[PDB]
Structure formats: C-alpha cells, structure tokens
Symmetry: C3
C-alpha cells in the first residue's frame, strides 16, 4: 500500500499520500460513483482525505457527505481533514475576499463541516490562511472548544510562515499537526524562506499540494525548460508520467511532506502513489529544480 506516517509529535497517523477533494465538482461525479471512487483509493492505501471551507463554492463537503451517507462504515477506514478561515465572494455576505479567524466563526465552520460531511468528528482542522487580524488567543480558544467535545481531534494550519506558525503555537496546549503548503518546481519559495526547516526541526510533516491537473505548462512557456527537464528525467527513471516525477520530487524533501492528490480517476491516483518507487538521484532533483529556476547553487 501507501506508506503510513505520523504527521507530528502528539499527532495522528496519516497515509503518505492524501486524496484531495478540491475539484470534486469538476469531476461531475455522482454519489454512488464517489462511494466507489473512495473505496478504491481507500484500498490503494490512500486513507486521508483533504477538504476545506470554501472549496467548490461551499459545495464539496456536502457532496462528499452524500456519498459517505451511502456507506456509513467508510468513516472508520479514513481520516478527514478540513479547513476554515477564508471568506470567498461565492457568498453574498462576502463582497470582498477577506479572512475570518474569529472564535465563533471557526466553531461555526467546524460544526458545519461535521454536518456537510455527515460525520460526528473531524480528524484534523486547519486555519486556512494566516490573517493579519488573527489573534492566536481567539483561535486557540476556538480550538479548545472544538476539542473539548471530541468534534475535532487534531489542529493545524495552512500557508503559515514560521513566524505565524510559532505565534499560534505559543497559545495551544497541543502540537500543531501540520502546515499544509504549496511545494513544487514551479513554486519553491518555501524551500528557502524557513518554512520547511521549521517543520523538519519540530518534526511536523507538511501536507503538500501542487496545482497539477491545472495545466500550468504547455500554456505558459515560462516553464518550458522545466517541462523539457521533467520529461527527460521521467525517461531516466522510466516513470509512468512527468506528473509522477513531480510527486517524487516533493517526496524527496527532507521534511517528508505528504503530497496531496487532485484527480478524479483511480488509475491516475494509482500512478501518483506509484511515485514511492522512483529512485530519484540528488543530481536529478537539482537538475529538475534548476530548470524551473534558471540557475545553479
């Protein structure tokens, strides 16, 4: 199967690869088609699922839920991850995209997740983004409430800078279980700004998402050189696809990030998990890396 990994000190055990339902709507899938899509990725080994507040105009959690309703026994076999803290214009209350990391709202979204997902509990809850107006005390007070009722068992953050992660962390009696961030050849800032070193140092493993199926290639020649490099390295490793070379590039990071998969086909999901068997050489990591950038060192 897929390797199992404890995301943090007092944290939970997750599957190295997580299924992300960011684009569940795009898949034009039906409830009985999802219960079977799930089972198939659950059987592959991918048992951790990534959901969020605003994903799909506040529809994805609901959709997933309908399916969880068809096979209620599927919960035990999985670990659910959801988020809150973001306010999109998909709602009329939000004329502008702003953040909301206030107590009641975090409790609100949390409890709304349980309902939409048709579950009595979330394995992990993350503050979607760092809000300039975030008050670590207020958030930490929200977490204490959700935890006190067994509604949420582990807490985390997403897209937090070392400084923000440390701020919120100085207020919680429990260990932030992760910092879900964006990591890939096309987006490597997190590799040098301290974010991944803090994670490795604290032994907290990052859930990594890479806008893959987005098509951020072939239509932005800025990264043609990376396209050409991910292509040759792919043959060298005799991999199934360049996307597979990308998943393995992330897996090599010393922080041991858990790559998030965004696809609607078990076969591509299988191929993604197959990245755990590519023997990428340091030289191949740097060569990929360098082509995305354009220089050495």
């Amino acid at each position: 199967l897929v390797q199992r990994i404890t995301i943090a000190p007092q944290g939970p055990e997750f599957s190295r690869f997580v299924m992300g339902y960011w684009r569940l709507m795009d898949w034009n899938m039906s409830a009985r088609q999802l219960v079977s899509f799930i089972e198939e990725h659950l059987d592959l080994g991918v048992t951790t699922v990534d959901h969020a507040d605003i994903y799909g105009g506040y529809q994805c959690e609901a959709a997933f839920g309908e399916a969880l309703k068809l096979a209620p026994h599927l919960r035990e076999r999985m670990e659910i991850v959801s988020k809150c803290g973001i306010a999109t214009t998909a709602r009329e209350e939000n004329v502008i995209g702003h953040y909301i990391t206030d107590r009641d709202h975090i409790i609100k979204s949390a409890e709304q997740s349980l309902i939409n997902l048709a579950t009595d509990h979330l394995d992990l809850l993350l503050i979607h983004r760092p809000d300039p107006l975030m008050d670590a005390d207020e958030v930490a007070d929200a977490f204490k409430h959700l935890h006190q009722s067994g509604k949420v068992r582990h807490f985390g953050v997403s897209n937090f800078t070392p400084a923000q992660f440390a701020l919120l962390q100085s207020r919680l009696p429990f260990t932030l279980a992760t910092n879900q961030v964006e990591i890939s050849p096309v987006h490597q800032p997190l590799l040098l700004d301290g974010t991944l070193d803090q994670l490795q140092q604290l032994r907290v493993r990052p859930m990594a998402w890479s806008c893959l199926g987005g098509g951020r290639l072939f239509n932005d020649d800025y990264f043609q050189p990376l396209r050409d490099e991910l292509a040759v390295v792919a043959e060298e490793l005799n991999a199934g696809s360049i996307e597979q070379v990308v998943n393995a590039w992330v897996l090599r990071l010393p922080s041991q990030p858990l790559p998030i998969i965004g696809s609607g086909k078990i076969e591509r999901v299988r191929a993604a998990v197959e990245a755990e068997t590519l023997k990428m050489t340091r030289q191949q990591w740097f060569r990929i890396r360098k082509a995305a950038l354009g220089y050495d060192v």
Copy 2:
C-alpha cells in the same frame, strides 16, 4: 477617557493613545500655551507622551521642559517616553547620519533628556533604531546603569526587526516594553514580516506612529485609491474624518498597538481618541488595506 493598557509583562501602564511631540516646534506654540495644551490632553485621558533624541534638531525636549517647569505638578499625571541612538546632521559632530548605540552615549542622551525635560526620571527609554554596529551587551550595560539610579524605569526599542529585538532582549534581565514602529495602510510591511507576530506572541504592545499630518495624500496619487477608500469607509462608519478611520484601522490590529498622535490642536486630538468608538468591520479593514496595496488575499 482613553483606555489604559499595560504595554508588556513587567511593563508600565500607558494610555492607549499617546501624545507625540515630534512636531512641537512646527506648532509655534509658547510655554504657557503648551502647559495648557498638555492639561487638556491629560484631561482627555491621553497621559503618555512621546519624545525623542533628534526630534526638532535637539530642541523639542527642551521646549516641552520649559512648559513642565510652569506646572511642576504635571509630571505625576503623565508618563514620559524618550529615545536615543540616532545622530543627525543637525549637529556639526555628525557630518553624516549614522547611529550611536555605545554605552556612554546612551547614558549621555538619557541624562540629557532628564535635564531638557526638567524631570528626575523617564518612564521609558528606547533605542531609536537598530544599528548594524549595535552590541546588545553594551546597550544592556547602559540600561543597567540608567535603571540602577531610578533615572529610567522601563526600556524599549523602536524600528527593530524580530531578530534585533530578540538579540538585545537576550541580554536584559527585564522585558523590553515595546517596539515603537510605523503602521498604516501606506506602510504595511510590518504586518507580514514577523514584527507584529513577535509582539503579540510576547504580549508586548507596539507604540505605533503614522506620518499623518504630513499630507501623504493629495500629493502622491499613488495612494489616491486608498484616499477614495478611506473616504467611503469613513461615511459608512459615519466618522469625524478619514484620519479617524486611519487611527481605528491601526487600533484593530491584534497586537493592540498604541497609536501615537501628532497634532497641535486638542480638538483634533479629541477626534483622534474618538476612534475608539468606530465599529470597523473585518470587511472594512481589508477593503481599506487592499486599496493601499492593489490586490486581494
């Protein structure tokens, strides 16, 4: 009145709003006019006053002092804040603008403040700026001297980065009481570089100054969009003035900064303190913020 606030763990109690005498000379005010200007802001609730070394070509402290001489009993009713560490070309010894954070000089300026201000003690003393040549041991040795004589009772810094604040802090047996910094829609770097998170994390409240009466609008169309936004939000909050909307924008920061007021009229001072009653919405904070920048998130 104005809210009272303990600026830091073992720190002093200050008034949420402080009177800043940066432009005391510009006000072409007389000594008896200042003793009465003071009383009036002391009666409004603003009891903490901000002074500095180089302010007014080394004249402002002296001026304030003359006035403190007319009503000696005004001291007890206030808290004095002054600074040192900057060397301006307003003096012939300084052919160039450099920093001086050496022991004797910090003691020198300090003691010179007491004399100019006509007081036996300063409530708080700040290192004006971070000097690349700053030696935390040397400064900390200076602070120990000034404190030992009751001449200075609390120490702080101004415009220090998290790294510099931590460096000096690792040498003092007492807690740095603040990091007086610049915060406003026009200057928001401190909102994302860690500076305010460190403050909130350590529970040290920042004295915030915003070059307001400078006229950094109407003559720099770069911030016309912010001008237009601070204008509409002002009507929405039915505030006295856009300047009042600005003071409230700062007050909303989770770090609870103490806004510094730079004006020479009790009425505008009153209006400034009136910002504690504007009910700014998160959406209104972000909209202001965003107009200054030019993008979301």
Copy 3:
C-alpha cells in the same frame, strides 16, 4: 601577534585572522616554499588555516599536505579548518553543481581531508552550504561518527541562514562553532537579514571571507563610489592600503568576525593583520558602508 579568540561557547581558540588557502594553486608555489610561507604566517600569529572540499578542483588540501609532510611538527602550531557538502563539475561524477550532505559522503570527504592534509585530525569541519535536501539528523549522525574517533573535534557551517543554522543545531549535542560567511562593503546582506544577530546572540563568532584579491573594483564601476570612499578613509586612518581599511571594516562588526585572508605573500599577510591597529570611527564605518549602498540610515 594576532589576537586569539574562542569562536564559540564550547568551541576552540582561533587566531582573529585566519589564513585561507582558497587560491593556493594560483600562487604557483612549491612544497618547500609553502612550509616556509606557513611558518612565517604562524610566526606572525595567524595560526588558523582555512581549507575546503572543492577548493582548487580538489587539489589544495593535497598541496598543503605535501608541505605539512616536510615539517610534521607544524601541526601542533596550527588549527585546521576544512569543509564538505559541495559537488562541483570539476569531477565527472558531477555533471551539474549540486549539494551532497548525506552521511557517508560527509564522512568520506572528512576522512579524505585527513589523508590529503596529512593529519590524523581536523580541528573544525563545516557543512559547505545549506542544501535544500539537507537532513539535520543525517548530518548530525555524520558529525557524531567523525567526532567519536577524534578525527574531527569541532563542527560548524558556512553560508547558513538563521533558520538553517537553528535546524542543524537542534540535532547536535555540541555547539556549532561558527557560520563562515561573506561580509564586506560590496556584500552586506548578512548585516540586516538576521544572520549576524543570531551569531552575536549565541556568541558564535563568524569566519568572514571577502573576495578581495579578486579585483572586484576598477572593473565594475558600480562600486567606484566605494572605491573612492575606501580611498579617502584610508588616508584619514593613514593605513597601508585600502584593503587594510576593508579588513578593519569587518573587524568592527559587533559579531567579532574572524577575517579570512586570501594572499600568497607574507608581506600582504602582515599588512592584513595590521588592520587590528586602525582606529576606525563609527562615522568612517557608515560612510564606507553608505558609499557601497548609495543611501543613508
């Protein structure tokens, strides 16, 4: 002689100025000419020597060694510093310049240093550069091995950011003895990004190298203004040369860096060490600094 300085808490005693053999090959020097060059700088007081993995296409250590072979008793009188972690195209295994901070390789290079240098032990070993793929545990495991055999007695790093230095440091039972970095008017980033404050805070002294004999002047008018300023300040201090003014500029940093000298003539080496007697004024430090930049503050 040259001042002696303990580079860190549980660290070794070094000479304020270290001899760097980065360009030993360029000197077209012979083995018996080096044994005598060494003695002469050993007699001047400079007893700490800086070597590295890739320096001179993997030839410099060997060269130095041949000379150490002629006067075996020269070891006791010196302190040897070497590095590893960099992979240059000077080797056919490295088609591209990448980093290698994996266990066996660190042990490999280390042991190869002992052989090339003709010594049973290295006083200090540094990880050449921070590798995005660096695993603090792996490196720390390498250090524990080398130390366990007395082969290496002190460990350090080079060109690490505060975050990287802290990461590796959280894994070692001993104190990183230094962070050898580049410091000079032409390269002052380290003066504001936290690097030198971390060092001063932890009391770890940085080995500083400044590409001096490179001729980064007279052929890059971008720094003519700095050329002109280092020239006048030189007369003011009545120094031997502008290079001497540069060495003293570095020596003034509060972090007390140990300047590394890259020259092949004892006379210039003497002149370098002579920088410990120039009485640079704060004003002269800033004026130099400012000319390199182009603005005040």
